[PDB]
Amino acid sequence: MQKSNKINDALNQHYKLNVELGLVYAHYAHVADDEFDMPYLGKFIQHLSEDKLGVHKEYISDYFKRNGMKLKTDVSVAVKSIPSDAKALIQEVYARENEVRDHVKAIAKLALAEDDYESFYFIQWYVRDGLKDLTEVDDVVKLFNSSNDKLIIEETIKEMVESEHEIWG
Amino acid sequence: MQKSNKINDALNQHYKLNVELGLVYAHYAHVADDEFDMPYLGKFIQHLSEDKLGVHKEYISDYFKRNGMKLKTDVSVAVKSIPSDAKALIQEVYARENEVRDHVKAIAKLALAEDDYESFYFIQWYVRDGLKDLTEVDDVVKLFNSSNDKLIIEETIKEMVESEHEIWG
Amino acid sequence: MQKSNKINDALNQHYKLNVELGLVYAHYAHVADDEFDMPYLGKFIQHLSEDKLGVHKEYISDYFKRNGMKLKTDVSVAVKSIPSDAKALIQEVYARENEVRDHVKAIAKLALAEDDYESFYFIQWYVRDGLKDLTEVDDVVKLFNSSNDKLIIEETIKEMVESEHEIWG
Amino acid sequence: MQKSNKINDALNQHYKLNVELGLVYAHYAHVADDEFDMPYLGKFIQHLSEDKLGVHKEYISDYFKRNGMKLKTDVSVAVKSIPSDAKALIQEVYARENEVRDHVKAIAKLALAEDDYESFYFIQWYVRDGLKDLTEVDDVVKLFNSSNDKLIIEETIKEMVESEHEIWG
Amino acid sequence: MQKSNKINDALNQHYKLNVELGLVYAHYAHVADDEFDMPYLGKFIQHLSEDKLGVHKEYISDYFKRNGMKLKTDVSVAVKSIPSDAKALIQEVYARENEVRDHVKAIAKLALAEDDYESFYFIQWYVRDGLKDLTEVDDVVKLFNSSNDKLIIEETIKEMVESEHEIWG
Amino acid sequence: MQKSNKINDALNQHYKLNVELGLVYAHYAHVADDEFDMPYLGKFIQHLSEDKLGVHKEYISDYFKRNGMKLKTDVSVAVKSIPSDAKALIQEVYARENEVRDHVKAIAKLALAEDDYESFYFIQWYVRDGLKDLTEVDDVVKLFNSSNDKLIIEETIKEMVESEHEIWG
Ligand SMILES: [Fe+3]
Ligand SMILES: [Fe+3]
Ligand SMILES: [Fe+3]
Ligand SMILES: [Fe+3]
Ligand SMILES: [Fe+3]
Ligand SMILES: [Fe+3]
Ligand SMILES: [Fe+3]
Ligand SMILES: [Fe+3]
Ligand SMILES: [Fe+3]
Ligand SMILES: [Fe+3]
Ligand SMILES: [Fe+3]
Ligand SMILES: [Fe+3]
Ligand SMILES: [Fe+3]
Ligand SMILES: [Fe+3]
Ligand SMILES: [Fe+3]
Ligand SMILES: [Fe+3]
Ligand SMILES: [Fe+3]
Ligand SMILES: [Fe+3]
Ligand SMILES: [Fe+3]
Ligand SMILES: [Fe+3]
Ligand SMILES: [Fe+3]
Ligand SMILES: [Fe+3]
Ligand SMILES: [Fe+3]
Ligand SMILES: [Fe+3]
Ligand SMILES: [Fe+3]
Ligand SMILES: [Fe+3]
Ligand SMILES: [Fe+3]
Ligand SMILES: [Fe+3]
Ligand SMILES: [Fe+3]
Ligand SMILES: [Fe+3]
Ligand SMILES: [Fe+3]
Ligand SMILES: [Fe+3]
Ligand SMILES: [Fe+3]
Ligand SMILES: [Fe+3]
Ligand SMILES: [Fe+3]
Ligand SMILES: [Fe+3]
Ligand SMILES: [Fe+3]
Ligand SMILES: [Fe+3]
Ligand SMILES: [Fe+3]
Ligand SMILES: [Fe+3]
Ligand SMILES: [Fe+3]
Ligand SMILES: [Fe+3]
Ligand SMILES: [Fe+3]
Ligand SMILES: [Fe+3]
Ligand SMILES: [Fe+3]
Ligand SMILES: [Fe+3]
Ligand SMILES: [Fe+3]
Ligand SMILES: [Fe+3]
Ligand SMILES: [Fe+3]
Ligand SMILES: [Fe+3]
Ligand SMILES: [Fe+3]
Ligand SMILES: [Fe+3]
Ligand SMILES: [Fe+3]
Ligand SMILES: [Fe+3]
Ligand SMILES: [Fe+3]
Ligand SMILES: [Fe+3]
Ligand SMILES: [Fe+3]
Ligand SMILES: [Fe+3]
Ligand SMILES: [Fe+3]
Ligand SMILES: [Fe+3]
C-alpha cells in the first residue's frame, strides 16, 4: 500500500494553490470593501478566502497523516496589481476558480492512472467543490451584468450570504 | 474547462428518457388503479412517475446551468398498448428500469473516456439510483409471484409506501 | 349515466396541453436562470411547470377513473426557439395562459351543451385556475414595464414566491 | 445488465475475509483483556470485530440481492498462535487492515476494468473504510510507542472509544 | 478452584457451534429474502444469526476470562446445499435449534458430574435460551402449515419481529 | 488626520508576520500529530495557526479600511527543517511568540513617537495578546520538563484545549 509520489506532489501543489489563493482573496476582499465601497462583495470574497485557507488545505494535510505522504509548506504570493473595478475583481476570482477545476481534474486523472483509489475517492470532494465554488462565484458575476447600480448589486449579494444541493453540496 | 459535447448529448438523451418514462408511468399508474383495481400499485407507480419527472430531470438541468451545456427539450411518447394485467404491468416497469441502469452505465463509461470527472461525479447519483429504483420495483414484482390474491398484494404494497440504505439511498 | 365522448376527447386534449405546457415551462425556467441570469423568474416559471404537470393533469386522470372516461397519453413537444429576452419570455408564458382560458371556456360550453353537469362542475376548478394563473403571470409581466433593472425586478419576483383569494384561489 | 462473475468472486472473497477477520479480532479482543490485562484495548478490538462481522458483510450480502450475484459462505479460520504482547497484538491488527486496503483496491480496479459502475460505486464505501479503519487502528499503535505504562495507554484508549470526518467517515 | 478441562472443552465446542450456526443463518437469511422472496423471514433468521454470533459467544468468552479457561477459535463451515423452499428452510433452522438444546443438556449434566457449580449456574442461561430460541423458531414453522400464501405468512412474521416471558426470557 | 507611513509599513510588516507564522504553525501542527504522535499538541498548535491567520490579520486589514492605510500582501515562507522532537517543536513556537512581543513593542513605541494615538490604541490589543499567546505556549513547554511520558503530557494538553483573564484576555 505504498503511497504514490506523483499524487503526493500534485496534492502538495494543490495545497500550495489553496493557501495562496486564500491569501489573494483576503486581499481582494479588503479592496472590494475599501476602495470599491462594496462590503458585501468583500464578505463574499472573505468567506471564499477562509474556505481556501481552511478545509481545502486541512483535508490534504489530514489525508497525508493517514497514508504516509509528506506535507510541504512552500508559499510565495504577492498581490502586485489590483483589478480596475469590482466587476473585473469578481471576474478575476472566477478565472482562478475555473483553473481550480482544471487542476483537480488532472489529479483525478492521475489517481486513476496510478490505481490510487483512495486518492481518487479523496479527490471527489475537490471535484465536487470545484463546480460548487465556481457556481457561487458565477452567481455574483452575473449581478454585474444585470445592474449598473452598485447598491442594488450589494443588496443582492447580502441576501446571498444570509444550504447544500443534493449533489454539489 | 470546455464542456464535452458527447456528454452533453448523452445527458440530454437521459433527460428525455426520464421525462418520457415519467409520462408512461403516470399512465400505468392510472391503469393500475382504474382498470386493474389496484390503487396502491397505482400510488407506487405514481411516485415513480414523479421521481422521473422531478429530480431525475432537475439535476440534469441544474448541472447544465453550472457547466455551459445546453438543454434540449424534444419529447415524443404515446402509450399505445397497455400490458394485459398488473403482474405484466409492473414487470414492464422493471424492464424499463433495467434499461435505465444500462444507459447510465454508458454515461459513466463515456465520462471516464472523456476525462470529465465532474460528469463522472454527477452521474454517481444516477449510477446509485438505477439500482435503488430497480430494487423498489423488484420488491413489488416479487409480490405477484407470492400471492394469487390481489387484495393481499395490495395490502403489502400499502405498507411499502408508508428510509435510505447507507449506500444505495 | 353514460360518459360523453365529446367531453372525453376535450379533456384528453386538455390533459395533453397541460403536460406539454409543463415541459415547455420547465425549459423556459432553465433559460430564465441560465441565459437570462434571472433565477427567481426561473423559480416562478418552474412552479408554474410543476403546477401544469401536477394537479392540472392529476385531476383529469382522477376524474376519468370515477366516470369511465379513458385516458390517452400522446405527447409531442419540442422547444425549438427561445424568446429573445426575459420580458419576451414571460410575455410568451402569458400568451399560452391566455389560451388556457380559451380552451377551458370551450370545455364548459360543451358540458352545458351535453347536459354533463358533473363535467361542468369539474371544469369550474379549471375555469377559476385559468384566471388565477393568468393573474400571477401578469403580475410578473408588469414588472418588466416598471423597471429597466433586472436585479430590481428579480428582488420583486422573490417576494412574490415567498395565499388564496376567496373567489379565485 | 448481466452481473460480472469476476466481481462476484472477488466480493465473495471479500465477504469471507471480513467474516474471518471478525472472528480473529473477537479472539484478539479476549486475549487483550484476559492475558494482557488491557480491557479497553479489548473493547477497541471487539468493536472492530463487530464492524467486520456486521456491515462489512451485510452490504455485500445486500448488494448481491439487488444485482443477481450469488452469495457463498465458505469459512475456515483457526487462531493457532497469539502475538507475544499487546503492542505486537495491535501491530498485527494493523497489518491485516493494511491488507484490507490492498484487497479493496484490486476490487475497484477490477470494476473499472469490467465497466461495472454499480460495483465501482458500491466499493467506494470499502475504499473509504479501508483508510478509516486503518487510521483508528494506527491511533492505538502510536500509544505503545508513546508510553511504557499500560495503564496510561489503557486510559487513553478508553477516551478513544467514548464522530465522522467529512470525507473518511 | 481449578477449572475443569472437560467443561473447558465442551464450552469451546459450544462456542464454535454458535459461531458456525450464526454464519449458516446469515446465509439462510440472505436466501430467504433473495431467492424465496420472503424478506421478513430473512429478518427473523438474521436476528437469530446475530443472537448466535453475539451474546451466545460473548458470554462464553466472558466466562473464560473470569475462571482461567482458555478460549479456542477453530471454525470451519461451508453452506454447500440450500433447502428447497422456505418451509424446509425454517424447518432446518428448527432442527439445528433442537440440537442446541441437546448440547446444552450435556453441558449441564457434565457440570453437575464435575461439581462445577459456577459452570452449572452459567449454563442455566443456555438451558433457558435453548427452549426460548426453539419456541420462536417454532412459531414461524407453524405459519407454513397454516397458510399457502407466502404474503399472508410474511405479514404475520413482520408482526412477530415488531418481550420476555417471566421464566423463559 | 493624515495617516503615518511609518506605522503603515510596520503594520504591513506585522500583517505579513502573522500570515507567515500562521502557515508555519499549520505545518508544525501536522508534524506534531503525524510524526511525533501528539495529536493534542497538534490541536493546540493548529488553534494558534488559525489565531494568527484570523483576527491577528483581520484587525490590521480592518484598521486600514478605516484610516486610509494601504494593505500589502507579500508572502514568502518555506518550512525547510523541522525541529527534532516535540519539546523542541513547542520550544520553537515559544521563540517565535517571544519575537512577536518584541515586534509589537516597537510598534507601540513608534505610534507614541508619531503621535498616532489611534494606532497606539489599536496596538494595545497586540500588546496584550503578545503576552497571552506567549503564556499559553509556555504552559505547554512546561509540560515537557514535568513528564517523560508523552501520553501523560498529551492528556494534560487535551484538558488545556477543553476563558479570559480580566487583564490579559
Ligand atoms: Fe493544484
Ligand atoms: Fe465595512
Ligand atoms: Fe461556502
Ligand atoms: Fe506527515
Ligand atoms: Fe467599483
Ligand atoms: Fe489502469
Ligand atoms: Fe470550496
Ligand atoms: Fe431593494
Ligand atoms: Fe432585504
Ligand atoms: Fe430581507
Ligand atoms: Fe438515456
Ligand atoms: Fe382510488
Ligand atoms: Fe422514491
Ligand atoms: Fe443552459
Ligand atoms: Fe389485474
Ligand atoms: Fe484516459
Ligand atoms: Fe429514482
Ligand atoms: Fe392482512
Ligand atoms: Fe393485515
Ligand atoms: Fe396493515
Ligand atoms: Fe399496520
Ligand atoms: Fe385543451
Ligand atoms: Fe441558481
Ligand atoms: Fe401556484
Ligand atoms: Fe381509465
Ligand atoms: Fe434578459
Ligand atoms: Fe340544454
Ligand atoms: Fe394553475
Ligand atoms: Fe430591498
Ligand atoms: Fe427583501
Ligand atoms: Fe424582506
Ligand atoms: Fe478480499
Ligand atoms: Fe473486564
Ligand atoms: Fe467504528
Ligand atoms: Fe442471492
Ligand atoms: Fe502485554
Ligand atoms: Fe474501459
Ligand atoms: Fe470498518
Ligand atoms: Fe491520567
Ligand atoms: Fe479521563
Ligand atoms: Fe474524562
Ligand atoms: Fe456444543
Ligand atoms: Fe429487501
Ligand atoms: Fe431474540
Ligand atoms: Fe483467556
Ligand atoms: Fe419458497
Ligand atoms: Fe456428585
Ligand atoms: Fe438465543
Ligand atoms: Fe399489520
Ligand atoms: Fe399493525
Ligand atoms: Fe512585525
Ligand atoms: Fe488524529
Ligand atoms: Fe486562543
Ligand atoms: Fe485599503
Ligand atoms: Fe517526539
Ligand atoms: Fe511626543
Ligand atoms: Fe493571539
Ligand atoms: Fe486522567
Ligand atoms: Fe481527563
Ligand atoms: Fe476530565
Side-chain angles (χ1 to χ4, degrees):
Chain A
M1 269 315 291
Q2 293 58 49
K3 59 95 172 174
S4 166
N5 304 319
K6 284 210 79 194
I7 295 287
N8 206 159
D9 294 337
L11 281 182
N12 263 303
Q13 207 55 25
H14 201 53
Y15 184 96
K16 164 188 174 76
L17 167 57
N18 278 283
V19 172
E20 288 175 359
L21 265 196
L23 297 170
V24 168
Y25 294 165
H27 197 107
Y28 285 4
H30 175 93
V31 172
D33 178 3
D34 201 25
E35 184 183 312
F36 297 152
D37 297 334
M38 294 191 72
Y40 280 115
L41 186 64
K43 276 163 200 138
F44 171 86
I45 300 180
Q46 185 63 38
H47 292 353
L48 198 56
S49 169
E50 287 152 14
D51 185 42
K52 301 302 185 194
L53 279 154
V55 296
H56 278 255
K57 95 176 183 338
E58 217 47 58
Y59 292 162
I60 290 159
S61 160
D62 173 74
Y63 182 47
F64 287 179
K65 294 192 266 225
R66 301 168 183 271
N67 61 10
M69 292 174 173
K70 292 274 111 154
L71 177 69
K72 298 221 190 67
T73 299
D74 179 350
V75 167
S76 72
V77 70
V79 176
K80 309 192 74 201
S81 34
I82 317 273
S84 54
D85 50 62
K87 174 163 140 102
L89 189 69
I90 199 58
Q91 265 169 347
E92 171 67 24
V93 176
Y94 185 92
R96 292 163 183 268
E97 294 305 308
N98 221 351
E99 277 144 17
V100 167
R101 299 166 64 200
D102 213 74
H103 288 299
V104 316
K105 177 212 266 223
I107 297 177
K109 190 190 205 199
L110 176 57
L112 292 181
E114 294 279 303
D115 293 289
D116 189 345
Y117 294 97
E118 301 180 327
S119 306
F120 186 72
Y121 183 85
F122 167 81
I123 210 55
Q124 301 300 298
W125 189 90
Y126 294 81
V127 178
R128 176 212 46 76
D129 212 68
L131 201 48
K132 202 230 51 183
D133 278 351
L134 188 93
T135 306
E136 292 181 351
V137 175
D138 192 54
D139 287 346
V140 188
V141 177
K142 285 162 160 231
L143 307 178
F144 288 84
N145 312 303
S146 323
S147 198
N148 29 73
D149 195 297
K150 146 184 319 191
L151 286 200
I152 296 320
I153 301 181
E154 266 282 293
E155 171 190 25
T156 301
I157 298 175
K158 88 162 91 205
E159 311 267 67
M160 282 177 56
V161 309
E162 71 161 41
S163 92
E164 296 197 349
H165 187 276
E166 161 94 331
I167 295 188
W168 300 106
Chain B
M1 269 315 291
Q2 293 58 49
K3 59 95 172 174
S4 166
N5 304 319
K6 284 210 79 194
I7 295 287
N8 206 159
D9 294 337
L11 281 182
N12 263 303
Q13 207 55 25
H14 201 53
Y15 184 96
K16 164 188 174 76
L17 167 57
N18 278 283
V19 172
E20 288 175 359
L21 265 196
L23 297 170
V24 168
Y25 294 165
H27 197 107
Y28 285 4
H30 175 93
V31 172
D33 178 3
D34 201 25
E35 184 183 312
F36 297 152
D37 297 334
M38 294 191 72
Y40 280 115
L41 186 64
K43 276 163 200 138
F44 171 86
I45 300 180
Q46 185 63 38
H47 292 353
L48 198 56
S49 169
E50 287 152 14
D51 185 42
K52 301 302 185 194
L53 279 154
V55 296
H56 278 255
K57 95 176 183 338
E58 217 47 58
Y59 292 162
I60 290 159
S61 160
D62 173 74
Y63 182 47
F64 287 179
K65 294 192 266 225
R66 301 168 183 271
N67 61 10
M69 292 174 173
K70 292 274 111 154
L71 177 69
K72 298 221 190 67
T73 299
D74 179 350
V75 167
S76 72
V77 70
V79 176
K80 309 192 74 201
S81 34
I82 317 273
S84 54
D85 50 62
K87 174 163 140 102
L89 189 69
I90 199 58
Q91 265 169 347
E92 171 67 24
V93 176
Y94 185 92
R96 292 163 183 268
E97 294 305 308
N98 221 351
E99 277 144 17
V100 167
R101 299 166 64 200
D102 213 74
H103 288 299
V104 316
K105 177 212 266 223
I107 297 177
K109 190 190 205 199
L110 176 57
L112 292 181
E114 294 279 303
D115 293 289
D116 189 345
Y117 294 97
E118 301 180 327
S119 306
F120 186 72
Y121 183 85
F122 167 81
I123 210 55
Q124 301 300 298
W125 189 90
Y126 294 81
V127 178
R128 176 212 46 76
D129 212 68
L131 201 48
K132 202 230 51 183
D133 278 351
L134 188 93
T135 306
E136 292 181 351
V137 175
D138 192 54
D139 287 346
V140 188
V141 177
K142 285 162 160 231
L143 307 178
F144 288 84
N145 312 303
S146 323
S147 198
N148 29 73
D149 195 297
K150 146 184 319 191
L151 286 200
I152 296 320
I153 301 181
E154 266 282 293
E155 171 190 25
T156 301
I157 298 175
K158 88 162 91 205
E159 311 267 67
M160 282 177 56
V161 309
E162 71 161 41
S163 92
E164 296 197 349
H165 187 276
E166 161 94 331
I167 295 188
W168 300 106
Chain C
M1 269 315 291
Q2 293 58 49
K3 59 95 172 174
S4 166
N5 304 319
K6 284 210 79 194
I7 295 287
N8 206 159
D9 294 337
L11 281 182
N12 263 303
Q13 207 55 25
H14 201 53
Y15 184 96
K16 164 188 174 76
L17 167 57
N18 278 283
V19 172
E20 288 175 359
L21 265 196
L23 297 170
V24 168
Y25 294 165
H27 197 107
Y28 285 4
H30 175 93
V31 172
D33 178 3
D34 201 25
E35 184 183 312
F36 297 152
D37 297 334
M38 294 191 72
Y40 280 115
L41 186 64
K43 276 163 200 138
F44 171 86
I45 300 180
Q46 185 63 38
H47 292 353
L48 198 56
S49 169
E50 287 152 14
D51 185 42
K52 301 302 185 194
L53 279 154
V55 296
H56 278 255
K57 95 176 183 338
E58 217 47 58
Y59 292 162
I60 290 159
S61 160
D62 173 74
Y63 182 47
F64 287 179
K65 294 192 266 225
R66 301 168 183 271
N67 61 10
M69 292 174 173
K70 292 274 111 154
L71 177 69
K72 298 221 190 67
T73 299
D74 179 350
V75 167
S76 72
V77 70
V79 176
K80 309 192 74 201
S81 34
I82 317 273
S84 54
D85 50 62
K87 174 163 140 102
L89 189 69
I90 199 58
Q91 265 169 347
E92 171 67 24
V93 176
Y94 185 92
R96 292 163 183 268
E97 294 305 308
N98 221 351
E99 277 144 17
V100 167
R101 299 166 64 200
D102 213 74
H103 288 299
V104 316
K105 177 212 266 223
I107 297 177
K109 190 190 205 199
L110 176 57
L112 292 181
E114 294 279 303
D115 293 289
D116 189 345
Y117 294 97
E118 301 180 327
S119 306
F120 186 72
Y121 183 85
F122 167 81
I123 210 55
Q124 301 300 298
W125 189 90
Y126 294 81
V127 178
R128 176 212 46 76
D129 212 68
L131 201 48
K132 202 230 51 183
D133 278 351
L134 188 93
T135 306
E136 292 181 351
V137 175
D138 192 54
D139 287 346
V140 188
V141 177
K142 285 162 160 231
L143 307 178
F144 288 84
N145 312 303
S146 323
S147 198
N148 29 73
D149 195 297
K150 146 184 319 191
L151 286 200
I152 296 320
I153 301 181
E154 266 282 293
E155 171 190 25
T156 301
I157 298 175
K158 88 162 91 205
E159 311 267 67
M160 282 177 56
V161 309
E162 71 161 41
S163 92
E164 296 197 349
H165 187 276
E166 161 94 331
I167 295 188
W168 300 106
Chain D
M1 269 315 291
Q2 293 58 49
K3 59 95 172 174
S4 166
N5 304 319
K6 284 210 79 194
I7 295 287
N8 206 159
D9 294 337
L11 281 182
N12 263 303
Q13 207 55 25
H14 201 53
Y15 184 96
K16 164 188 174 76
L17 167 57
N18 278 283
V19 172
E20 288 175 359
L21 265 196
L23 297 170
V24 168
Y25 294 165
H27 197 107
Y28 285 4
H30 175 93
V31 172
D33 178 3
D34 201 25
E35 184 183 312
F36 297 152
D37 297 334
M38 294 191 72
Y40 280 115
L41 186 64
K43 276 163 200 138
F44 171 86
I45 300 180
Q46 185 63 38
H47 292 353
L48 198 56
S49 169
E50 287 152 14
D51 185 42
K52 301 302 185 194
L53 279 154
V55 296
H56 278 255
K57 95 176 183 338
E58 217 47 58
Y59 292 162
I60 290 159
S61 160
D62 173 74
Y63 182 47
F64 287 179
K65 294 192 266 225
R66 301 168 183 271
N67 61 10
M69 292 174 173
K70 292 274 111 154
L71 177 69
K72 298 221 190 67
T73 299
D74 179 350
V75 167
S76 72
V77 70
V79 176
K80 309 192 74 201
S81 34
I82 317 273
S84 54
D85 50 62
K87 174 163 140 102
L89 189 69
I90 199 58
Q91 265 169 347
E92 171 67 24
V93 176
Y94 185 92
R96 292 163 183 268
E97 294 305 308
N98 221 351
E99 277 144 17
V100 167
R101 299 166 64 200
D102 213 74
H103 288 299
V104 316
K105 177 212 266 223
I107 297 177
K109 190 190 205 199
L110 176 57
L112 292 181
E114 294 279 303
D115 293 289
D116 189 345
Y117 294 97
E118 301 180 327
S119 306
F120 186 72
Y121 183 85
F122 167 81
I123 210 55
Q124 301 300 298
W125 189 90
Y126 294 81
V127 178
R128 176 212 46 76
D129 212 68
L131 201 48
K132 202 230 51 183
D133 278 351
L134 188 93
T135 306
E136 292 181 351
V137 175
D138 192 54
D139 287 346
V140 188
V141 177
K142 285 162 160 231
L143 307 178
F144 288 84
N145 312 303
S146 323
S147 198
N148 29 73
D149 195 297
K150 146 184 319 191
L151 286 200
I152 296 320
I153 301 181
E154 266 282 293
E155 171 190 25
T156 301
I157 298 175
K158 88 162 91 205
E159 311 267 67
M160 282 177 56
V161 309
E162 71 161 41
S163 92
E164 296 197 349
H165 187 276
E166 161 94 331
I167 295 188
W168 300 106
Chain E
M1 269 315 291
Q2 293 58 49
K3 59 95 172 174
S4 166
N5 304 319
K6 284 210 79 194
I7 295 287
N8 206 159
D9 294 337
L11 281 182
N12 263 303
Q13 207 55 25
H14 201 53
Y15 184 96
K16 164 188 174 76
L17 167 57
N18 278 283
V19 172
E20 288 175 359
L21 265 196
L23 297 170
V24 168
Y25 294 165
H27 197 107
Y28 285 4
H30 175 93
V31 172
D33 178 3
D34 201 25
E35 184 183 312
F36 297 152
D37 297 334
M38 294 191 72
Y40 280 115
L41 186 64
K43 276 163 200 138
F44 171 86
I45 300 180
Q46 185 63 38
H47 292 353
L48 198 56
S49 169
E50 287 152 14
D51 185 42
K52 301 302 185 194
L53 279 154
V55 296
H56 278 255
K57 95 176 183 338
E58 217 47 58
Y59 292 162
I60 290 159
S61 160
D62 173 74
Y63 182 47
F64 287 179
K65 294 192 266 225
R66 301 168 183 271
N67 61 10
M69 292 174 173
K70 292 274 111 154
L71 177 69
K72 298 221 190 67
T73 299
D74 179 350
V75 167
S76 72
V77 70
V79 176
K80 309 192 74 201
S81 34
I82 317 273
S84 54
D85 50 62
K87 174 163 140 102
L89 189 69
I90 199 58
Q91 265 169 347
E92 171 67 24
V93 176
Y94 185 92
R96 292 163 183 268
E97 294 305 308
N98 221 351
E99 277 144 17
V100 167
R101 299 166 64 200
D102 213 74
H103 288 299
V104 316
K105 177 212 266 223
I107 297 177
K109 190 190 205 199
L110 176 57
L112 292 181
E114 294 279 303
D115 293 289
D116 189 345
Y117 294 97
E118 301 180 327
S119 306
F120 186 72
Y121 183 85
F122 167 81
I123 210 55
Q124 301 300 298
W125 189 90
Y126 294 81
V127 178
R128 176 212 46 76
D129 212 68
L131 201 48
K132 202 230 51 183
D133 278 351
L134 188 93
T135 306
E136 292 181 351
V137 175
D138 192 54
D139 287 346
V140 188
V141 177
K142 285 162 160 231
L143 307 178
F144 288 84
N145 312 303
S146 323
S147 198
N148 29 73
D149 195 297
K150 146 184 319 191
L151 286 200
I152 296 320
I153 301 181
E154 266 282 293
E155 171 190 25
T156 301
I157 298 175
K158 88 162 91 205
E159 311 267 67
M160 282 177 56
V161 309
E162 71 161 41
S163 92
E164 296 197 349
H165 187 276
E166 161 94 331
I167 295 188
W168 300 106
Chain F
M1 269 315 291
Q2 293 58 49
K3 59 95 172 174
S4 166
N5 304 319
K6 284 210 79 194
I7 295 287
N8 206 159
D9 294 337
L11 281 182
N12 263 303
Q13 207 55 25
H14 201 53
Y15 184 96
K16 164 188 174 76
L17 167 57
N18 278 283
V19 172
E20 288 175 359
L21 265 196
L23 297 170
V24 168
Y25 294 165
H27 197 107
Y28 285 4
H30 175 93
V31 172
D33 178 3
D34 201 25
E35 184 183 312
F36 297 152
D37 297 334
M38 294 191 72
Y40 280 115
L41 186 64
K43 276 163 200 138
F44 171 86
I45 300 180
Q46 185 63 38
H47 292 353
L48 198 56
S49 169
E50 287 152 14
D51 185 42
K52 301 302 185 194
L53 279 154
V55 296
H56 278 255
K57 95 176 183 338
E58 217 47 58
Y59 292 162
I60 290 159
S61 160
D62 173 74
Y63 182 47
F64 287 179
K65 294 192 266 225
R66 301 168 183 271
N67 61 10
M69 292 174 173
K70 292 274 111 154
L71 177 69
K72 298 221 190 67
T73 299
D74 179 350
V75 167
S76 72
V77 70
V79 176
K80 309 192 74 201
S81 34
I82 317 273
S84 54
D85 50 62
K87 174 163 140 102
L89 189 69
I90 199 58
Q91 265 169 347
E92 171 67 24
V93 176
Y94 185 92
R96 292 163 183 268
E97 294 305 308
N98 221 351
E99 277 144 17
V100 167
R101 299 166 64 200
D102 213 74
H103 288 299
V104 316
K105 177 212 266 223
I107 297 177
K109 190 190 205 199
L110 176 57
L112 292 181
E114 294 279 303
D115 293 289
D116 189 345
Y117 294 97
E118 301 180 327
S119 306
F120 186 72
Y121 183 85
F122 167 81
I123 210 55
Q124 301 300 298
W125 189 90
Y126 294 81
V127 178
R128 176 212 46 76
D129 212 68
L131 201 48
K132 202 230 51 183
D133 278 351
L134 188 93
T135 306
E136 292 181 351
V137 175
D138 192 54
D139 287 346
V140 188
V141 177
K142 285 162 160 231
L143 307 178
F144 288 84
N145 312 303
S146 323
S147 198
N148 29 73
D149 195 297
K150 146 184 319 191
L151 286 200
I152 296 320
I153 301 181
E154 266 282 293
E155 171 190 25
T156 301
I157 298 175
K158 88 162 91 205
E159 311 267 67
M160 282 177 56
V161 309
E162 71 161 41
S163 92
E164 296 197 349
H165 187 276
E166 161 94 331
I167 295 188
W168 300 106

